[PDB]
Structures are given as C-alpha cells and as structure tokens.
Design a protein around this ligand. Structure first.
Ligand SMILES: O=c1[nH]c2cc(C(F)(F)F)c(N3CCOCC3)cc2n(CP(=O)(O)O)c1=O
Ligand SMILES: O=c1[nH]c2cc(C(F)(F)F)c(N3CCOCC3)cc2n(CP(=O)(O)O)c1=O
Lengths: 220, 365, 49, 50
C-alpha cells in the first residue's frame, strides 16, 4: 500500500512538474512584435490603416516584398481592418487587448503615446521616409529666405527642441513611458506566495492542535 | 556602399567600373532627366568643407562651385553652409546619429544562474519560513537545553513519534518545499528550452544615466561637433563626459571605432552616422548592432551648382524616385539584400542545445 | 480633384493667392512640388506601427 | 554537511531533469522541409539549379 501510494504520488508530482514547465516554456516563447515584417509573418494579430489617405494608398501601390503581402491581407481581410477616422483606429487598438494593430503617421503616433491613459506605443522604425516643409507660392520672395531659415533652425537644434516641447515635455506621460521601460522580465513571487499562505495556515492549525492536544491530555 | 570599385574594375572602363547605391541612383536620375553622364571620383576625396583662411571649398562641393563638375551624386549632407553656395535637391535618404554596441552575446554562470530562476525575493521568504518552522517545532519540545534543541530543529530544518501537532507541520512544510522545487525545475526547463538573451536598452539617455559602459565619437567631424554645440539636456551631459573621459574615448577613424566596440566585450559604444552603422551591422562577423532611434534628423541630397539647368529637373526626379519606392528599394539592395549578416534570421533559427558547467559551478562553491 | 482640376486646402489657398505662406504639417509630395515651393524638411517622418 | 549536500544534489538533479526536458522539446522543434516555401524561409540548407 505504501509502495503503490508512493508510485502514485510520484507520477502526480512528475505530471505537475512537467505540466508547469510547458506553461513556463511557452510563456517565454511569446515574442512581441517590433518590425513590419512581423505583422506579415503572423495572422493572430490583425492590422489595418485608414480607409482613405496616403497611408492606405502606400501599401496598395507599394511593390516592396513585405508591404506587398501586408496589403494583400488587408485588401480582403474580414471584417474590415480599415477605420473611418484616426480616433476610431486608436480606439480599436485600445479595445482589442492587443489583437489589433493600427498603421499611421509616426508624428501623430508618437503624440498619442504621450496621451492618457498611456496605453499605446510605437514599435519598430518607420516604413518609409517622408517629411513636412514650409510651403510658399512658386516664385515667391519669401522662398529662399524661409528655406535657409528652416536649415538654420534645425542646426541650432531649435526644431528638435520644439518637438520635445510639444510631444514629450508637454507631458504628462511622463510616467507611462517610465513604466514601459520594460524592466521586469522573469518569473514571479505571486504563484509561490500562494504556497506560503497554505504553509503558515498549516503551522497555525498545528499550533492549535498543540494547545488543544494538551487540553485533551489534561482532561484525560 | 554608395560608390565602390567593382570586382574586375581593372578589366572595365567608364561608368561600368563603379557600383553602389549612388551609382544606381545616378542612372535613375539620368533616366528621368534625360542625359548621358560620366562618373568621376573627386580628387582630394573630401565631401564639402570650407577652409577658414583661404576661404576655398574642397571636395565635391568645391568641384561644383569652380565648374569642375555639373552635378554631385553622393552621400552629401544638406547643410546650411553648403545650401548658400550650391543647390540641394530634396533628401533622397533621411538619417542621423546612432549608437553602436557589441553583438547581443551572452555568457555567465555565477551561482547567480540558480538564484534567477528562483527570484531573490523567493529565496529570502523560503529562508524566513525555513527558520519560521524550526522555531515552531522548537516550541513543541535550561538556556542550553533550548540551544541544543534549536540546533536539533535546525537539523530537522536542513531538509530531508506521532506528535500530531508538529506532525502536520512536517507534512505541510514538505508539501511546501515539494511545490517550490517542482517550480524551480519546471521554470529552469523553460529557461533551457527558449534561452533568450536580451541586452541593455536603446536610448541615448541610457548612456548618460550610466558609466559602466564607456562611449565616444570620431575625434573630428560633425558627429563630435554636434555634442559640443548641442544645448539639449541629454546630449549635454554626454559631451561633458566624453570631453574629459580618460583614456580618450575618441577614435582616429571609423574603422578604429568599430574595432574598439568589437574588442571591448560590450564595454565601449561608438556613436556614428546611422547610414554607415546599418551597413556595418550587415558585415562579418556580424557582431555589431544599432540601438534606439537617431539622435538628430539629417539627410543627403543631390548637389547642383547655384542657378543650374539641372536644378529643378533633378529635384523632381528625387521626389519621383522616392514615391515609386525606388529609393527604398535601392537601399534594401545594397544594405540588406547584398548584406551578409542577419538578425531576424538568427532569431528564426530554431536550433541549439548543450549543458556546460557555469550554473552548476555556483552550487559547488 | 481630378475632374475640376482644382486645388483645395492650404496648397490651394497658396496657388490662388489667398495666402502668402503655409506653415503646417504639409507633406512634401511630387504632385505639390510642381505647383508650389517646398522648403527643406523641418521634420522627417514616415509610417509607423 | 548532510543538509548542504542534500541541497546541492537537489539542484543538480533538478538541472538534469530540466535540461533533459529541453533536449526533447527542441528535438521536436526541428522541422524538415515539406515544400518549396520551406527553402525560402530558411538559409541553413543551401540550394540551386542547373
Ligand atoms: O500634407 C498632409 N499632412 C498630414 C499631416 C497629418 C498629421 F500627422 F496629423 F500631422 C495627417 N494625419 C495623420 C494621422 O491621421 C490624422 C491626420 C495627415 C496629413 N495629410 C493627409 P494624407 O493624404 O492621409 O497623407 C496630408 O495630405
Ligand atoms: O557631406 C558629408 N557626407 C558624409 C557621408 C558619410 C557616410 F555616411 F559615410 F556616407 C560620412 N561618414 C559617416 C561614418 O563615418 C565615416 C564617414 C561622413 C560625411 N561627412 C563628414 P561629417 O562633417 O562628419 O558629417 C560629410 O561632410
């Protein structure tokens, strides 16, 4: 009986150990994205762009390997992976529990990341190289002057300064970024803690049986 | 990889001698602007500076101002000092200053590979509860009599009649340690399966917040002069450090800087142009990588003599090429496609397995 | 607009003499560089995730 | 001595068990080429034509 019971508990504790390992092995397998190629190599996480704009038209006309496949997916993805406005897209990302990604201009994206509840973040580098500029009527007098002015401002780091002022400083968050640092990355005390409480509970039960036992003895 | 001498350049002539990003970019520009061209290498081999004394321009920018060439197709930075003397088309490649570190390697046992699976906080509590049981048992069984017993319960602690009280204590404590050792084993197996080795953190701010890892730039160039003149918070502190760091954190050439990063075991970081950095990452032995975004926003452009006929045409040509994704295509061709290294392929390579001694050693000590 | 061939927004107000200059996040595109003049980029960007 | 030696052997046998689990997990991870797409997704195995 003692032998068979031992062989019985041996199998169980072995099963518990083995099973607990798969949940920890897979827990490590999980690899968040980081690049656009990661969106094409997988399907679990849906993604889309604005239903109308240069962003959407980019993938459609793009002849690049990765971006091609991406468009092929979004072009026939059901339900519609495209949103009406930028606000709708962000809302879809905040309500999908990380099941939906939204593609948009880095500028507006970086700004959103610095807005409550600080639940969005930009990943990987940009997909293409664009740029804003000061527009002046063809053959204008302000033409050359403004052009040089922009170059002067950038070299004085005034442009970078302005961006920092309205994007990061203006925040704010400013907190959600310090927690997004991505420090932690191991197991935990939580699970092990549950076994500590059941231990102290057993000790207390014994401390009760001790006194109780003594009392019983006395009675006897 | 903008302009390089082809393999059998000795058996070739004209434009066929050269190959690279700019070499292809030249043919593209010439096709959209409609003109024949002759690729020529600048004499002094410089980009475009202005000697304060003689007030003379050198390099490509020079050959443009003095009528030596009609157009400049190279990684020429669009600077204010140059925009005054020549004309720059819209940027055909945006870049900036980046950070280069060693290969996210990995290796270290320090009995500390045993305290990791099991958190330091957990090793502590398991010890507190350890003496927490040897003290409860101690109350079950004059001053020395308590010492001999406390040493006996500590031996009943150092793990392996029917007093029901302390009996269930030994049973519950056994079930407790059973779960823990099972957790340690399971978790350690996960570790031995995936075995992912991260690294530091991408963020120039990370270089300023620490000192363990030294870092520097080229002893001469816009890169170094950037930090010196930069009035930005983070970059300020960085310069203050590099300005008085001993030994010299500055290198003579770019090759020396890369060599310093490859021979410091990740103790030295090198700051350089993202363009050249990204390229280095795709070169054997593939032991360098760029981290974090650029520190500033720059950009190369096609340079044309002030008030030239090719001015407007080339400008539009660059914009046309970028929108057709032809520029991005060219970069991919010379940086990644023609590359040799690999990062997303090294992570896609599911294969490895072997036990060492490091971790086990910590338990021996 | 393809049909009317009319420019709208800021780029429009520039071509039709409504404004003297446009200071905004206006993307530098080929289609626009043909009708108006763009200074060097004051902010480089792209498509992100 | 008996306690520390026990804790020592405990760690070792735990390491052996964990590591042995990994040698079988990875042994399953290994996949063999089933189609052409498999030749493009990997680089370890070179390939060519006439
Ligand atoms: O010149 C242009 N500059 C633009 C600048 C921005 C912003 F980033 F907000 F500054 C945006 N958004 C990005 C996010 O969605 C909301 C608005 C759109 C722009 N568009 C329209 P497109 O045709 O979709 O490119 C232009 O034409
Ligand atoms: O017009 C310019 N174009 C440049 C283009 C490149 C490259 F990226 F290699 F193409 C570099 N390097 C970056 C890495 O270190 C080795 C050379 C320097 C350039 N410089 C000198 P700066 O004064 O330091 O900017 C210019 O002046």
């Amino acid at each position: 009986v003692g032998g068979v019971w031992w062989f019985f508990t041996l199998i169980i504790i072995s099963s518990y150990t083995a099973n607990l390992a798969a949940f920890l092995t897979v827990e490590r397998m999980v690899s968040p994205i980081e690049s656009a190629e990661d969106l094409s190599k997988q399907t679990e996480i849906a993604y889309g762009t604005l239903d109308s704009g240069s962003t959407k038209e980019f993938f459609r006309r793009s002849k690049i390997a990765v971006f091609d496949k991406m468009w092929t997916y979004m072009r026939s993805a059901e339900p519609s992976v495209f949103v009406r406005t930028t606000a709708e897209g962000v809302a879809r990302v905040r309500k999908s529990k990380g099941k939906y990604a939204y593609l948009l201009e880095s500028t507006m994206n970086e700004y959103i990341e610095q807005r409550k509840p600080c639940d969005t973040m930009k990943v990987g580098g940009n997909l293409d190289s664009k740029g804003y500029g000061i527009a002046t009527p063809k053959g204008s007098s302000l033409g050359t002057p403004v052009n040089l002015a922009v170059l002067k401002l950038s070299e004085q780091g005034l442009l970078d300064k302005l961006k920092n002022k309205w994007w990061y400083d203006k925040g704010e968050c400013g907190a959600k970024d310090s927690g997004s640092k991505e420090k932690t990355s191991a197991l935990s005390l939580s699970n092990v803690a549950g076994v500590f409480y059941i231990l102290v509970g057993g000790l207390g039960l014994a401390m009760l049986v001790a006194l109780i036992e003594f009392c019983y003895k006395s009675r006897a | 990889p903008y302009v390089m001498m082809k393999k059998n350049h000795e058996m070739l002539e004209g434009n066929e001698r050269y190959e690279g990003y700019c070499v292809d970019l030249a043919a593209e520009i010439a096709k959209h602007c409609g003109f024949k061209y002759k690729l020529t290498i600048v004499g002094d081999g410089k980009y475009g500076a202005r000697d304060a004394d003689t007030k003379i321009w050198n390099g490509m920018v020079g050959e443009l101002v003095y009528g030596k060439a009609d157009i400049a197709i190279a990684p020429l930075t669009i600077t204010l000092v140059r925009e005054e003397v020549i004309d720059f088309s819209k940027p055909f490649m945006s870049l900036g200053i980046s950070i280069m570190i060693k290969k996210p390697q990995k290796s270290k046992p320090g009995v500390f590979s045993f305290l990791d699976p099991l958190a330091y906080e957990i090793w502590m509590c398991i010890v507190f509860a350890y003496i927490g049981v040897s003290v409860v048992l101690f109350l079950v069984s004059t001053n020395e009599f308590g010492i001999f017993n406390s040493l006996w319960f500590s031996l009943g602690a150092f793990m392996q009649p029917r007093s029901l009280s302390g009996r269930i204590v030994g049973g519950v404590w056994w079930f407790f340690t059973l779960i823990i050792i099972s957790s340690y084993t399971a978790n350690l197996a996960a570790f031995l399966t995936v075995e992912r080795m991260v690294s530091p953190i991408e963020s120039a701010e990370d270089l300023s917040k620490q000192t363990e890892i030294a870092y520097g730039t080229l002893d001469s160039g816009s890169t170094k002069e950037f930090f010196r003149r930069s009035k930005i918070a983070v970059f300020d502190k960085m310069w203050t450090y590099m300005r008085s760091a001993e030994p010299s954190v500055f290198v003579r050439t770019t090759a020396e800087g890369v060599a310093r990063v490859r021979k410091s075991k990740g103790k030295y970081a090198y700051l350089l142009e993202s363009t050249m950095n990204e390229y280095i990452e795709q070169r054997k032995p593939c032991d360098t990588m760029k981290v974090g975004g650029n520190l500033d926003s720059k950009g190369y452009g096609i340079a044309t003599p002030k008030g030239s006929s090719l001015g407007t045409p080339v400008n539009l040509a660059v914009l046309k090429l970028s929108e057709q994704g032809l520029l991005d295509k060219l970069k991919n061709k010379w940086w990644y496609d023609k590359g040799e290294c690999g990062a997303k392929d090294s992570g896609s390579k599911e294969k490895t397995s072997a036990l060492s001694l490091s971790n086990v050693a910590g338990v021996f000590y």
